Design an enzyme around this catalytic site. Structure first.
Site, PDB file in Angstrom:
ATOM      1  N   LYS A 114     -35.704 108.313  23.564  1.00 19.23           N
ATOM      2  CA  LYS A 114     -34.464 107.614  23.257  1.00 19.23           C
ATOM      3  C   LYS A 114     -34.728 106.110  23.177  1.00 19.23           C
ATOM      4  O   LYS A 114     -35.517 105.571  23.954  1.00 19.23           O
ATOM      5  CB  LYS A 114     -33.356 107.966  24.272  1.00 19.23           C
ATOM      6  CG  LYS A 114     -32.828 109.395  24.121  1.00 19.23           C
ATOM      7  CD  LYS A 114     -31.519 109.600  24.865  1.00 19.23           C
ATOM      8  CE  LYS A 114     -30.963 110.999  24.728  1.00 19.23           C
ATOM      9  NZ  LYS A 114     -31.613 111.960  25.662  1.00 19.23           N
ATOM     10  N   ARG A 153     -15.969 118.644  29.988  1.00 13.98           N
ATOM     11  CA  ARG A 153     -15.512 117.873  28.832  1.00 13.98           C
ATOM     12  C   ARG A 153     -14.979 118.756  27.710  1.00 13.98           C
ATOM     13  O   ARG A 153     -15.449 119.879  27.534  1.00 13.98           O
ATOM     14  CB  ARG A 153     -16.591 116.890  28.325  1.00 13.98           C
ATOM     15  CG  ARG A 153     -17.720 117.545  27.560  1.00 13.98           C
ATOM     16  CD  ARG A 153     -18.830 116.585  27.261  1.00 13.98           C
ATOM     17  NE  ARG A 153     -19.870 117.232  26.465  1.00 13.98           N
ATOM     18  CZ  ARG A 153     -21.089 116.741  26.304  1.00 13.98           C
ATOM     19  NH1 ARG A 153     -21.435 115.601  26.885  1.00 13.98           N
ATOM     20  NH2 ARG A 153     -21.978 117.392  25.569  1.00 13.98           N
ATOM     21  N   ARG A 194     -14.614 118.833  23.769  1.00 20.50           N
ATOM     22  CA  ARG A 194     -15.218 118.245  22.579  1.00 20.50           C
ATOM     23  C   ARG A 194     -14.727 118.795  21.215  1.00 20.50           C
ATOM     24  O   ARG A 194     -14.526 119.999  21.044  1.00 20.50           O
ATOM     25  CB  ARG A 194     -16.756 118.392  22.704  1.00 20.50           C
ATOM     26  CG  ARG A 194     -17.579 117.949  21.497  1.00 20.50           C
ATOM     27  CD  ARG A 194     -19.061 117.955  21.767  1.00 20.50           C
ATOM     28  NE  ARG A 194     -19.460 116.816  22.587  1.00 20.50           N
ATOM     29  CZ  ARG A 194     -20.674 116.276  22.579  1.00 20.50           C
ATOM     30  NH1 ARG A 194     -21.609 116.741  21.759  1.00 20.50           N
ATOM     31  NH2 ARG A 194     -20.950 115.239  23.360  1.00 20.50           N
ATOM     32  N   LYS A 226     -21.374 120.883  32.034  1.00 18.93           N
ATOM     33  CA  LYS A 226     -22.767 120.578  32.338  1.00 18.93           C
ATOM     34  C   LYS A 226     -23.016 120.772  33.845  1.00 18.93           C
ATOM     35  O   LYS A 226     -22.289 120.199  34.656  1.00 18.93           O
ATOM     36  CB  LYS A 226     -23.128 119.152  31.898  1.00 18.93           C
ATOM     37  CG  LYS A 226     -23.359 118.999  30.403  1.00 18.93           C
ATOM     38  CD  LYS A 226     -23.320 117.539  29.976  1.00 18.93           C
ATOM     39  CE  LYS A 226     -24.687 117.001  29.659  1.00 18.93           C
ATOM     40  NZ  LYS A 226     -24.633 116.025  28.542  1.00 18.93           N
ATOM     41  N   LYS A 245     -26.026 123.623  30.062  1.00 24.29           N
ATOM     42  CA  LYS A 245     -24.896 123.199  29.252  1.00 24.29           C
ATOM     43  C   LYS A 245     -24.308 124.501  28.690  1.00 24.29           C
ATOM     44  O   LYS A 245     -25.037 125.303  28.110  1.00 24.29           O
ATOM     45  CB  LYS A 245     -25.346 122.242  28.132  1.00 24.29           C
ATOM     46  CG  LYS A 245     -24.185 121.557  27.420  1.00 24.29           C
ATOM     47  CD  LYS A 245     -24.650 120.640  26.312  1.00 24.29           C
ATOM     48  CE  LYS A 245     -23.677 120.695  25.164  1.00 24.29           C
ATOM     49  NZ  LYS A 245     -24.071 119.793  24.051  1.00 24.29           N
ATOM     50  N   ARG A 259     -22.457 110.609  14.891  1.00 29.13           N
ATOM     51  CA  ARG A 259     -23.823 111.131  14.835  1.00 29.13           C
ATOM     52  C   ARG A 259     -24.345 111.378  13.401  1.00 29.13           C
ATOM     53  O   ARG A 259     -23.712 112.105  12.631  1.00 29.13           O
ATOM     54  CB  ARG A 259     -23.959 112.402  15.701  1.00 29.13           C
ATOM     55  CG  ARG A 259     -25.329 113.071  15.636  1.00 29.13           C
ATOM     56  CD  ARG A 259     -25.488 114.143  16.682  1.00 29.13           C
ATOM     57  NE  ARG A 259     -25.719 113.564  18.006  1.00 29.13           N
ATOM     58  CZ  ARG A 259     -25.459 114.188  19.150  1.00 29.13           C
ATOM     59  NH1 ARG A 259     -24.962 115.420  19.145  1.00 29.13           N
ATOM     60  NH2 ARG A 259     -25.684 113.582  20.309  1.00 29.13           N
ATOM     61  N   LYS A 270     -22.592 108.759  29.388  1.00 29.00           N
ATOM     62  CA  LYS A 270     -21.418 108.146  28.779  1.00 29.00           C
ATOM     63  C   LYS A 270     -20.193 108.304  29.710  1.00 29.00           C
ATOM     64  O   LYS A 270     -19.326 107.425  29.737  1.00 29.00           O
ATOM     65  CB  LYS A 270     -21.177 108.720  27.380  1.00 29.00           C
ATOM     66  CG  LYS A 270     -22.184 108.194  26.343  1.00 29.00           C
ATOM     67  CD  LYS A 270     -22.377 109.095  25.118  1.00 29.00           C
ATOM     68  CE  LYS A 270     -23.657 108.714  24.415  1.00 29.00           C
ATOM     69  NZ  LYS A 270     -23.912 109.528  23.197  1.00 29.00           N
TER      70      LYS A 270
END
Length: 463
Positions: free
Chosen positions: A188, A252, A254, A269, A282, A349, A446
């Site tokens: 990354k 989360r 999404r 997660k 995940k 993305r 995040k």
């Protein structure tokens, strides 16, 4: 007769005596008959049956020797091969020089099995040909009499089926030089917003932008990844992920693309500490937007959630039952832990990959944004909903109060390599990664960044 003796001359070079004396038996038939003016007797038959029983016993025993002799080489290599395999893991290892010899020895046994099989069969054909010629030239019946004698002493009955299978099994070990591939890498990098385009254009030449068949042409909307993170008043989930707690869950909701999207992914997660030896997981299940609020309440049951999937029949029940167990657990936590929308993560993305090629795979997350979804400051943002409706994917979300949004200063470039051993990654990747466009950095959350930034006043631990 004539065709039987002419073909008999095609015998194995080495073994000439051990073979059937067809000529010697053909002479005994013609010489005894000429003497008695084309007539056979009780005496001549018993004497001819003696000559045949002399040759049958000669053949049966030789074949009982050479059979055991070739089976000896088999036992010897079966043993040596089985011990070589044992020595693969031990302190004294077997090199490639060892297998080359083992193969060389098997090839030699293959030659012998072949010669044994050619001989047993050639001889049995001879005996069959001589009995058929005798019974024809004389009125005497010898075929079923002699068959009893041949069946009681078999050399021709050798199946070789199990020997051949064993030889192949042993030969395969020598072929595979023992008991019987690439290396993965994920890096990354931070990218300054000034380089997003340049970098995009560079990658573009090598790897194409991955576009999903969206039933319509590309729109900026189609690259949006919005994820609503859930936590409670006491921010239990945040602290757990922050202190990297064993089994620390993060929840989360999404959706990909714009607001038109109706399929919402209920993701979870689970953090697994290296001391467990198990990797973090995940897991997710899809859900229609019209059912989200009702599901999180408990009003829309797990059995109602998957009713269509069960009726569809595309997925195996074992998978459905795992997805049902997942949804049930996520439903249990939301209620027991009193979770609510806390922080929204948004980013665009752009994926880059060559179809059916994984040597290099790049992804670029841009416009990294964290928005408040909570009601911890009194202000009801969601209004009893699972997400705020005053915003969409309309970045930079200018309408939002400055203290509710965190527009992250950098972009994330992820390079995923799958390099086959001995080979190197492409020079274009090595050159890019080493350039002024990307900066080296480790992965961050995040969720944690969002909570620590936007809910600074509520949190005590800030990384």
């Amino acid at each position: 007769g004539k065709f039987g003796e002419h073909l008999s001359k095609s015998l194995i070079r080495q073994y000439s005596y051990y073979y059937i004396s067809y000529d010697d038996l053909k002479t005994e038939l013609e010489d005894n008959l000429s003497k008695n003016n084309g007539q056979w007797t009780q005496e001549l038959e018993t004497d001819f049956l003696e000559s045949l029983e002399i040759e049958l016993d000669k053949v049966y025993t030789f074949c009982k020797v050479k059979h055991s002799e070739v089976f000896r080489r088999v036992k010897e290599v079966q043993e040596q091969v089985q011990h070589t395999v044992r020595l693969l893991d031990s302190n004294n290892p077997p090199t490639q020089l060892d297998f080359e010899i083992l193969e060389e020895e098997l090839s030699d046994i293959i030659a012998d099995v072949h010669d044994l099989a050619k001989f047993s069969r050639l001889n049995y054909t001879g005996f069959q040909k001589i009995i058929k010629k005798h019974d024809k030239k004389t009125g005497f019946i010898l075929k079923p009499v002699f068959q009893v004698r041949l069946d009681s002493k078999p050399f021709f009955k050798e199946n070789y089926d199990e020997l051949v299978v064993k030889i192949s099994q042993l030969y395969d070990i020598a072929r595979t030089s023992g008991r019987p591939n690439f290396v993965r890498q994920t890096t990354k990098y931070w990218v300054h917003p000034d380089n997003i385009t340049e970098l995009k254009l560079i990658i573009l030449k090598h790897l194409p932008v991955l576009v999903f068949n969206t039933n319509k042409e590309f729109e900026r909307e189609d690259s949006a990844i919005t994820s609503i993170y859930f936590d409670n008043e006491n921010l239990d989930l945040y602290y757990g992920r922050l202190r990297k707690d064993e089994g620390a869950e993060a929840h989360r909701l999404r959706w990909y693309g714009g607001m038109s999207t109706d399929t919402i992914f209920v993701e979870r997660k689970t953090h697994r500490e290296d001391w467990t030896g198990e990797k973090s997981v995940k897991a997710r299940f899809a859900l229609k937007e019209r059912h989200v609020n009702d599901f999180l309440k408990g009003k829309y049951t797990v059995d109602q959630v998957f009713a269509k999937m069960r009726k569809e029949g595309k997925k195996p029940m074992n998978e459905i039952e795992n997805l049902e167990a997942l949804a049930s657990e996520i439903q249990y936590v939301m209620l027991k832990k009193k979770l609510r929308p806390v922080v929204r993560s948004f980013y665009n993305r752009t994926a880059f990959q060559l179809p059916g090629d994984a040597r290099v795979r790049i992804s670029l997350d841009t416009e990294l944004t964290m928005v408040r979804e909570d009601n911890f400051d009194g202000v009801d943002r969601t209004h009893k909903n699972w997400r705020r409706t005053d915003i969409g994917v309309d970045w930079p979300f200018k309408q939002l109060d400055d203290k509710d949004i965190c527009r992250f200063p950098y972009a994330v470039l992820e390079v995923k390599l799958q390099t086959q051993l001995g080979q190197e990654p492409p020079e274009w990747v090595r050159e890019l990664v080493g350039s002024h466009l990307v900066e080296p950095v480790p992965k961050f959350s995040k969720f944690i960044h969002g909570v620590a930034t936007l809910l600074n006043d509520k949190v005590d631990s800030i990384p």
